[PDB]
């Protein structure tokens, strides 16, 4: 695999080229910002059927041909005032003058105004059915003009401030289109509550992370800077696909929480690269060498777990997914970029402003209870677990209703009021769309035959008691073809959840010869996507799983850890679930929330299993990784675990605190599905971010320490060779496999290898012989080299040893250091490096900080500068990073002192 290359080159890049990524990835994400606010008017309320679908193809034949139904577009209860009633007719005549001025003012928008009130003297009984026996309120239908769904609201909305002062304000709205309006109001007043409510708490939360101004301002900027860019993108997307209401809370919802927590990531990186001694630069590329690259994993998985959503045919999920999608990928593209750039450019004074600016280990304790006693947790946690997975199994699903408001709610009041005034008129029929392959009309006889053959299925509503009372042609308005050779005809069902079997069963009905037959209406648009979404579970999951295992195997190097991940987020998956089905099937905790328990939507069973997973995910590979990664670390013992988590507990905690403040914004939602989906957010987070993360997950995984990081692979990670002195010195000094001269001219080799100051070449040629054991003829190998720079490194050691003024600071040091150490000494004598004796005692009492800069005030680092530079930040920061990442090539060789033969 590719660990590291390319990180590596993009880390150097970013401190390159820090202003102009800092502009232009600004300018990117502010201008989509200002192209995205458009992003509202191009958003659309379509996607909650299978397009697919027999009913779609019904619905879609029947409106071309016999006009769609605009009679629920707008039901208008009005209401005498004064107490008076219905049949004054003067207040007749002045609500009918206002209706009809409205009417002439809007004909772009409304069709017109029906309803008994425009012929009172009327003999229809349905008419007649339009007052009340009390004659004290009486509706009309206001259909609307427009041909989809979202011109039909756009033109209601255009009319409703007029409408509403019609009959002095006595007048309430109800059906499809003020139920929609209101439905679709409830995301920006879900934006503007985040706005407000969880912008302030996440700045608590990112400064009590932080404890400095700037650090915890730039995640907040980060995830402002997402937030742009993804509306944009979402806006560029509308242009092509059509991109669904709901996709713009996602964005905020999903996105922002994610965004803020990549930029703290990295944020806290970078201070504890610049707290062990690392450049600025140096930190800038080892932070994005190491938690960009986490980061960036973290945005696949979370790419891997929503694209599965792409299978189930409903644009809701679609447009759902294409906002995750673009939240989380510019959210890891911003925090590599933009984000170091800023800390680039910024260095340590990311830590200057403090606290007081005023203008307007507790982990590892509680994981070695878990560790040392385990089972008597593991078991409580898993079987309370289970028996929250028992309400699951009863789940309702259903379609959108009233009901989706709260109950206090104006609107869904007015459609209560007239559904309890006027109970007939509401109905949602099962239609039969007849259609000949051929384009000859069809007959009368034909229209009997369906007729019959319907009327032999049981359950269908029946008001009158006839034969031929059954089944009536739909009605056909203006709009319609009125084309022959299609015909449809309806009827309502008698029991609402007799619904998919009565469709099954018109679905069997043998059709007459030469015609086709589409059963539709809205019980069958609503189980038929029901059925799509039942029927493409399987294959999601699979995708799913499959998907984040393997992921999961990349990262932990394991193939018992991702199982044991696996089955631990789905467990934690129908744990959420059934307490989602607890709160709003059963309604525990409706009356707090201010909502109706009822069903749930199709989709966001879907939408909510991607989701937990997909976090479960995430999290789990965090805190899984870095006790896996304990090898690097050498420490073989179970004693991963609690390193692992004591390393990323208040990281954990901080991004889960973030990500659940921003859900607790919307848990709010006046929209049952954005509660339920909030809620389920909330749910799986403190699911795993607690009950998971601190107590099971140790648990069950001590019950395998040894036997589970890569437990049965074969070939499976290799491990980059530990960089050495030779590597060290061979930039330093050099290595050359022929014989050359110096820059005083003589004949060196290998590694600063001194053969004579003879300036006879075979002189040289004789004692590289002599020094190689065959005659060479001047080359070398690259083995022979580091053999005679091994000797060299010997003789080198054993002289500092017997110096008094250097065995003592030699002696205290590590490995790494002892090699600056020995850089210094072949550089410039043991005499040259004794006479440091500040610096050298900074060093002996570890005073890196000290000692580094005291050493680049020497004539040493006058004179050699970058090679100095680079045995001062070994002697700072104790690692080889100053080589493994180092400036050009060398140009002077100059042999070193301590030449061995
Ligand atoms: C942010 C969340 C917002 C959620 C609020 C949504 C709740 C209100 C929904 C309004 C739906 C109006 O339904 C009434 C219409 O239903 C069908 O047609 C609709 O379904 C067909 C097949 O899909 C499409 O071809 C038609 O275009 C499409 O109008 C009927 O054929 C139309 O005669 C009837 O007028
Ligand atoms: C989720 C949201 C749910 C919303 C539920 C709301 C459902 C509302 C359905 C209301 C439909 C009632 O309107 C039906 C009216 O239309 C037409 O009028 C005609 O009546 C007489 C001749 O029949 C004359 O007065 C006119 O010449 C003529 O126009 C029809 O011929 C009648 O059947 C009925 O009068
Ligand atoms: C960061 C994530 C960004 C992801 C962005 C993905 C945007 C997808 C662009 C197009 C929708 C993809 O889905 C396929 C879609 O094609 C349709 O229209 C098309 O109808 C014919 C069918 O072949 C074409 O020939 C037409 O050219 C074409 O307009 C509609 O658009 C969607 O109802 C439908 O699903
Ligand atoms: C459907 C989605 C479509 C996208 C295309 C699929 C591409 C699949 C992999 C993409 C490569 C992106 O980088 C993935 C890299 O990240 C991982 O992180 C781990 O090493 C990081 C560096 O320290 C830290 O994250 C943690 O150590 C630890 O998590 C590992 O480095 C490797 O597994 C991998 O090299
Ligand atoms: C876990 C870490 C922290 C998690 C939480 C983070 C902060 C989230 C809370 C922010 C505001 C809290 O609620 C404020 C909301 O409630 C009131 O209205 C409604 O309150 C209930 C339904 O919302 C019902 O009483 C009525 O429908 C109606 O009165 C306000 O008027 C709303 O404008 C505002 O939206
Ligand atoms: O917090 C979500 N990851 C966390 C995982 C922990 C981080 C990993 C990188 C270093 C800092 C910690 C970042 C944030 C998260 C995942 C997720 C998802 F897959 C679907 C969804 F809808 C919401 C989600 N949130
Ligand atoms: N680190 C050094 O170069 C020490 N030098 C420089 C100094 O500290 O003044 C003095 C000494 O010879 O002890
Ligand atoms: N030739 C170089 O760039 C390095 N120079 C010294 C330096 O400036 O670091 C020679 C040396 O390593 O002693």
Redesign the pocket.
Known sequence: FQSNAMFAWWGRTVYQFRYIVIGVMVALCLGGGVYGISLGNHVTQSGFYDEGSQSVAASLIGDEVYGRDRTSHVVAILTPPDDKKVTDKAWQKKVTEELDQVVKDHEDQIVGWVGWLKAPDTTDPTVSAMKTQDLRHTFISIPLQGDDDDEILKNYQVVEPELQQVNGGDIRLAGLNPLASELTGTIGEDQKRAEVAAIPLVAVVLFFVFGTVIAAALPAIIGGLAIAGALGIMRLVAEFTPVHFFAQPVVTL?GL??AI??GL?IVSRFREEIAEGYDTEAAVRRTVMTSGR??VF?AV??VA?SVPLLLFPQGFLKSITYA?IASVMLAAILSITVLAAALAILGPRVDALGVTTLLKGFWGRLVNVVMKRPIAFAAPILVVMVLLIIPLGQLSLGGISEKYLPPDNAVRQSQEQFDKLFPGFRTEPLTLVMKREDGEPITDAQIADMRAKALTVSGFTDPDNDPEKMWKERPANDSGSKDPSVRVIQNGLENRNDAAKKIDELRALQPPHGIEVFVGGTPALEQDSIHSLFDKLPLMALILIVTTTVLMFLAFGSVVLPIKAALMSALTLGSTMGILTWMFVDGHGSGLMNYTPQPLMAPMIGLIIA?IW??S???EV?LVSRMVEARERGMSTAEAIRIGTATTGR??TG?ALI?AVVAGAFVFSDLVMMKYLAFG?LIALLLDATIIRMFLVPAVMKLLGDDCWWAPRWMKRVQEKEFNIFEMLRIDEGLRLKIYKDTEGYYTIGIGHLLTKSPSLNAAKSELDKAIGRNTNGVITKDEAEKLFNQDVDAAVRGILRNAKLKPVYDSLDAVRRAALINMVFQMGETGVAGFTNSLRMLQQKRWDEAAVNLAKSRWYNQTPNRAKRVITTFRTGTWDAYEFHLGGIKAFHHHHHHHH
Do not use: E, M, P, R
């Open positions: 999903i929480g994610i927590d990549y990531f986490t980061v973290s998985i979370i777990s995750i989701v997909g976090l995910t995430d999290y965090f990281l954990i991004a990500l957010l």
